[PDB]
Amino acid sequence: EALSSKVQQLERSIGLKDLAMADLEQKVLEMEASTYDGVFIWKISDFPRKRQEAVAGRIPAIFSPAFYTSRYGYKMCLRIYLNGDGTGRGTHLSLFFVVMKGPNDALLRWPFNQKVTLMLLDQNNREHVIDAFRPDVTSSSFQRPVNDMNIASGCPLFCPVSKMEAKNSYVRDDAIFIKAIVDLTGL
Amino acid sequence: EALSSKVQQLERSIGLKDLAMADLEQKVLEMEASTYDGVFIWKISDFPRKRQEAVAGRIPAIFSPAFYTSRYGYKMCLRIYLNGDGTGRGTHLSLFFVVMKGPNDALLRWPFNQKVTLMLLDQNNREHVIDAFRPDVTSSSFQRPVNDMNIASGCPLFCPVSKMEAKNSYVRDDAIFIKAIVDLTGL
Amino acid sequence: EALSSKVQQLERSIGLKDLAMADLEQKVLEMEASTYDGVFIWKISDFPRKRQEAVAGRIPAIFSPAFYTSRYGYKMCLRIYLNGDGTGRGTHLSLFFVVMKGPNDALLRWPFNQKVTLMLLDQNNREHVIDAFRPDVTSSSFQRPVNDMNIASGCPLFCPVSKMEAKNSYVRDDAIFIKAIVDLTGL
Amino acid sequence: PVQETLH
Amino acid sequence: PVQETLHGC
Numbered sequence: 001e002a003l004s005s006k007v008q009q010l011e012r013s014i015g016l017k018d019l020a021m022a023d024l025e026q027k028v029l030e031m032e033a034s035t036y037d038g039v040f041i042w043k044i045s046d047f048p049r050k051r052q053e054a055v056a057g058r059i060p061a062i063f064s065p066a067f068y069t070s071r072y073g074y075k076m077c078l079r080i081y082l083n084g085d086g087t088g089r090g091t092h093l094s095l096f097f098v099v100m101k102g103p104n105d106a107l108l109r110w111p112f113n114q115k116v117t118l119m120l121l122d123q124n125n126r127e128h129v130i131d132a133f134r135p136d137v138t139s140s141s142f143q144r145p146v147n148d149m150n151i152a153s154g155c156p157l158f159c160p161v162s163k164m165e166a167k168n169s170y171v172r173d174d175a176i177f178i179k180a181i182v183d184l185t186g187l
Numbered sequence: 188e189a190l191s192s193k194v195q196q197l198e199r200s201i202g203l204k205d206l207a208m209a210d211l212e213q214k215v216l217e218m219e220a221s222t223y224d225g226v227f228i229w230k231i232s233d234f235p236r237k238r239q240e241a242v243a244g245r246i247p248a249i250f251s252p253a254f255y256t257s258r259y260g261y262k263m264c265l266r267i268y269l270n271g272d273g274t275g276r277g278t279h280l281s282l283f284f285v286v287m288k289g290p291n292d293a294l295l296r297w298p299f300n301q302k303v304t305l306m307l308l309d310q311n312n313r314e315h316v317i318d319a320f321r322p323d324v325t326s327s328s329f330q331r332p333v334n335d336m337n338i339a340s341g342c343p344l345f346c347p348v349s350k351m352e353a354k355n356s357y358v359r360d361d362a363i364f365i366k367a368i369v370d371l372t373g374l
Numbered sequence: 375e376a377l378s379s380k381v382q383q384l385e386r387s388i389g390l391k392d393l394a395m396a397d398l399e400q401k402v403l404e405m406e407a408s409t410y411d412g413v414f415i416w417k418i419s420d421f422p423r424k425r426q427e428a429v430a431g432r433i434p435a436i437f438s439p440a441f442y443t444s445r446y447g448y449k450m451c452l453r454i455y456l457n458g459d460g461t462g463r464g465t466h467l468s469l470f471f472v473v474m475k476g477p478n479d480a481l482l483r484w485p486f487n488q489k490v491t492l493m494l495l496d497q498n499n500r501e502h503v504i505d506a507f508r509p510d511v512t513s514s515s516f517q518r519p520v521n522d523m524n525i526a527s528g529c530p531l532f533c534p535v536s537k538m539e540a541k542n543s544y545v546r547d548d549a550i551f552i553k554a555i556v557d558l559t560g561l
Numbered sequence: 562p563v564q565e566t567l568h
Numbered sequence: 569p570v571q572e573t574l575h576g577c
Contacts, residue, residue, distance in 0.1 A: 003191055003377050007384065010198055014387050017205070021391060024212060025398060031219055032405055041446045043477060060568060072228045079565065086566040096565050103230055106310050106359060116562075123480050133562045141564055153562040172480060190378055197381070200388055204395075211399055218406055247577045259415045272576035283572050290417055293497045293546060303569075320569045328571055339572040 033065035038114075038182035040067040041121075042078060045175045051165065054083035061085065064178070066100060069187055074112060075102035078180055079152045086156040093120070093159035095178070096152035101145040111135065112142035115183035120159050120176065124169035129159045220252035225301075225369035227254040228308075229265060232362040238352065241270035248272065251365070253287060256374055261299060262289030265367055266339045273343040280307070280346040282318075282365065283339035288332035298322065299329035302370035307346055307363065311356035316346045407439035412488075412556035414441040415495075416452060419549045425539065428457035435459065440474055443556055448486060449476030452554055453526045462531040467494070467538060469552065470528035475519035485509065486516035489557035494533050494550070498543035503533045 042064045044050065053059040064078040081094040088094050099112045113135050120129035133154070135142040141153035164170040220229075229251045231237065240246035248268040255262055264285045272281040286299050300322050307316035320341070322329045328340035351357040407416075416438045418424065427433040435455040442449055451472050459468035473486045487509050494503035507528075509516040515527035538544040 003189070003194060006191075006198075007194060007377060007380055010194070010201060011380070011384055011387075013201065014384065014391070017201075017208075018387075018391060020208070021394060021398075024215060025394075027219075028215060028398065028401060028405070031215075035445055037445075039445070041478065041481075061565075071222055071224075071226070081565075086563070089566075094565070097562070104228070104364075106362075107228075107308065107312075107364065121481065136562050139562065139564065141562065152565040154565070156563050156565070175480070177478075177481060190381060194381055194384070197385055197388060200385075204388070204392055208395060211395065211402070214399075215402055218402065248572075258409055258411075258413070266572065268576060273570065273573040276576070281572070281576075284569065291415065291551075293549075294415075294495065294499075294551065323569055326569070326571065328569070340569040341572075343570050343572070 030065050033067075035067040036069075036071050036073070038067075038069050038184050040064075040078070040180045042178040042180070043175055044080075044178065047171055047174045047176055051082050054081065055090075061094075063098075067180075068102070069114065069182055069184060072104045072107065073102070073187060074105075074108060074114075074182075075100040076182065077149075078118075078178060079154075080178065083161065084156070088157040091161060092157045093161060093164060094154070094156045095120075095158040096154035096156075097180070098152045099142055099145060099150045101148055105144055108144075110142075110144040111137050113137060114185070114187070116154075117181040117183070118155060118158065119179040119181075120164070120170055121179055122169045123172045123177070126169065129163070129170070131155050131158060217252050220254075222254045223256075223258050223260070225254075225256045225260075225371050227251075227265075227367045229365040229367070230362060231267075231365065234269075234358055234361050234363055238269050241268060242277075248281075250285070254367075255289070256301065256369055256371060259291045259294070260289075260374065261292075261295060261301075262287045263369070264336075265305075265365065267365065270348065271343070275344040278348060279344045280348060280351060281341075281343045282307075282345040283341035283343075284328075284367070285339045286329060286332060286337045288335055292331055295331075297329075297331040298324050298326075300324060301372070301374065303341075304368040304370075305342060305345065306366045306368075307351065307357055308366055309356045310359045310364070313356065316350070316357070318342050318345060404439050407441075409441045410443075410445045410447070412441075412443045412558050414438075414452070414554045416552040416554075417549060418454075418552065421456075421545055421548050421550055425456045428455060429464075435468075437472075438552070441554075442476070443488070443558060443561055446478045446481065447476070447561060448479075448482060448488075448556075449474040450554075450556065451523075452492075452552065453528075454552065457535065458530075460530040465535060466531040467533040467535060468528070468530045469494075469532040470526035471554070472526045473516055473519060473524045475522055479518050482518075484516075484518040485511050485513075487511060488559070488561070491555040491557070492529060492532065493553040493555075494538065494544055495553055496543045497546045497551070500543060503537070503544070505529050505532060 061081045066077045079096040084092045085094040117132040122128045141151045251265040253264045266283045268281040271279045304319040328338045438452040440451045453470045455468040458464045491506040515524045
């Protein structure tokens, strides 16, 4: 009993600390993808699988790593519903912009008010899927963040499901690229 | 004895390793704060607590992460005494500049001779506490480093303890922001 | 047997964590050395020990961490034989350029066709060992990668073993610096 | 911009 | 610049 206890206790221990390893691995992961010039290219591998998980309702949307407007600027990321959200449910690829809580928010001007351009790159440089917008200053999505993330706001009808998938050049070798450009005017 | 010489040894294993993890986390935290353009914003949280540790003589000064003048430029960092050093002990906030041993020192010109500007940001962008200086070329503080760090050199009377702390806008949500700007002229 | 069994499982998960932690320390170190402007400066320490290992056949060549032409451009790295390869084996220092498989190859133009300049820095800034070239477009070394790395291509007879080693200024404090510059014209 | 439907 | 104190820390 003596050892049998001091044993399964070091195991529970061995497990708690394993959670602290997976966290640190993701923090490093987020760090490798972060940019600071307002430009971000998000590659989504295992496209087919992730589509299904969306259609099958299992996993409706995916968040992308974070990026900033400058070294100490706004922290942001994207969110995608490979099978639609709201008006584009089941018919369109929905793409959203997310204003996250940044470590420097106290130093930034609010509400967030930079033009944002969203793109679905054509892997044939022929015809990309592009759209843009200016923040709705009265929406809570662009108010100084209180939580980890604000409500995502963007293009629920960004791209017709058929357009991608099918064939074209958007999806190649089971992956797609999403590009976001945050206009830096004023910053 | 039976099989405890191993477990009581595995426990020493988990424990001697848990310390290596604290190292790594510190290195990851450091990579995440590094900049390479000579500009560095240092956020200090738990200001209240850290102020006591200074007054209570427990923790006199804190070092900040490192930053560089360029990808392969000089490595540097700041050092603050929330309760003063030298002429400003118990009256002022002492902020210093540190030239550290960088992996490319051999390729750099010495002594270090770049202007350095230091400031305590007013989280109301009203009146920032700023100060600047040009290296004392003959001072050991700016000669090619032999140790990890040279002797810190800067503003022992940077800012009156009373000015910050109290209220104002320098401290907000138990945290402050220190900024350094290294002039790159010549580099 | 019983506890003796749950004790081996415990020792297992411990060293397993120790391995993931070491794996991650490297990832960290690899991220710490990458650049995204086309310029890379590689410092090789323990030069003496590593030169010998080359002569003693044990370690013929060494790979350097990776770097890119831009945040989402080509992934590349260098390779050096401290005692020769091919035509300069045992006489010259062989330095090579490698086009690695990057996470964004699908978006890039191929074959790789960018001027590549290689240097052996003189720690006296006197006479650097410099060479340059334009990729052989019909060479497999510059086609879009299929493996982790393409066949290295470069300067087999870069710098005479004697030229360095001996003394001069290339070797100092048992370390040297190698530099690479990838022309960005057109990118 | 149009906000997402919660999730 | 004024150097930091030897003891201060």
